[PDB]
Write a protein that binds this ligand. Structure first.
Ligand SMILES: [K+]
Ligand SMILES: [K+]
Ligand SMILES: [K+]
Ligand SMILES: [K+]
Ligand SMILES: [K+]
Ligand SMILES: [K+]
Ligand SMILES: [K+]
Ligand SMILES: [K+]
Ligand SMILES: [K+]
Ligand SMILES: [K+]
Ligand SMILES: [K+]
Ligand SMILES: [K+]
Ligand SMILES: [K+]
Ligand SMILES: [Mn+2]
Ligand SMILES: [Mn+2]
Lengths: 197, 198
């Protein structure tokens, strides 16, 4: 049974950048539903596999990817933010950002652009490409998770579903993207990067 | 338990001159055999991932499961949908339903032909049964995506329009294959599948 992780901080800890009502809904309603539906779907898959029911396995794929991906993505996202965040990373991650994107500021522009560019629901990611040994930006639709659908290892995700920002920023997704940089937990992103090497 | 390649219920040359023996043997003994085997490999990996709660691994396996699982589902139906005893028109309640839902048998053939010719890339044309609406319905599916798993419709008749289903004999002219296949449709099987829905 997958479980809803506790947040690493309280729901208001990322104010004013992401308001407490959003964090509370996002974790306690949206992520909770992913977890609950993921568990239901995995149990149905166990049954289908035991019976050799390939039709049922395939019919369950959309629920599995959506809720499973929701669980994967949100579990990473909470750790990617912190009340003590903001600013720039240091060390090898900063070195890699400068090497692969030219500068920290150009990296921000490129992840911002990928995130603002999602049409519909989805996510922007900074990932690590293990084959190539370098950083890579990608966008993913809906809750499709980065590693399961692209092979890239997730380092930093930005949720651009409307429920991630709408109560506060309404349609103005770019204002949310500007604000979120103030709460990036570069410690966590660095840990994820260093685990890849 | 493991999925198995069903034997083809007739000789590889039983459908000549409509589908030749070289196609039938490659399609069954090479293409379908590979789907079954790859499906069983993917299922095994999926069980492991599920036991470990590895959702990333489950999602990464979805393309192979749908493609090879769908391949197994669709080809298993297809072999039974063809017969040397086939061709002609169905009878009874299936014919009545075709006339009711499509206007006539020939109109139905045109619509299923159009759906099958219209696949861009690899895929299948299907006649299915919509259990909720209680009537027949035509759909096209990409690659090996299977009808029931992706649409909920119950498959009655499938036509494979992957190039391996026809290319050796008909080359690029997919409409020549589709003309030919009507001569070997096993309407007895299609009828059985339809009656099982009702
Ligand atoms: K907050
Ligand atoms: K703000
Ligand atoms: K988790
Ligand atoms: K540089
Ligand atoms: K999704
Ligand atoms: K958010
Ligand atoms: K079998
Ligand atoms: K013969
Ligand atoms: K497929
Ligand atoms: K069926
Ligand atoms: K064929
Ligand atoms: K011919
Ligand atoms: K012909
Ligand atoms: Mn979200
Ligand atoms: Mn085929």
């Amino acid at each position: 049974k997958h479980s809803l992780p506790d947040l690493p901080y309280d729901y208001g800890a990322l104010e004013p950048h992401i308001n407490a009502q959003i964090m509370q809904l996002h974790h306690s309603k949206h992520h909770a539903a992913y977890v609950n539906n993921l568990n239901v779907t995995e149990e149905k898959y166990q049954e289908a596999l035991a019976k050799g029911d390939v039709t049922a396995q395939i019919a369950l794929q959309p629920a599995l990817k959506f809720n499973g991906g929701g669980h994967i993505n949100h579990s990473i996202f909470w750790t990617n933010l912190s009340p003590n965040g903001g600013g720039e990373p240091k060390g090898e991650l900063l070195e890699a950002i400068k090497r692969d994107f030219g500068s920290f500021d150009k990296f921000k522009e490129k992840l911002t652009a990928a995130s603002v560019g999602v049409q519909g629901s989805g996510w922007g990611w900074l990932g690590f490409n293990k084959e190539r040994g370098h950083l890579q930006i990608a966008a993913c639709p809906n809750n499709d998770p980065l590693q399961g659908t692209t092979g890239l290892i997730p380092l930093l995700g930005i949720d651009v579903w409307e429920h991630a920002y709408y109560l506060q920023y309404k349609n103005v997704r770019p204002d949310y993207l500007k604000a979120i940089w103030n709460v990036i937990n570069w410690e966590n992103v660095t840990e994820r990067y260093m685990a890849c090497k």
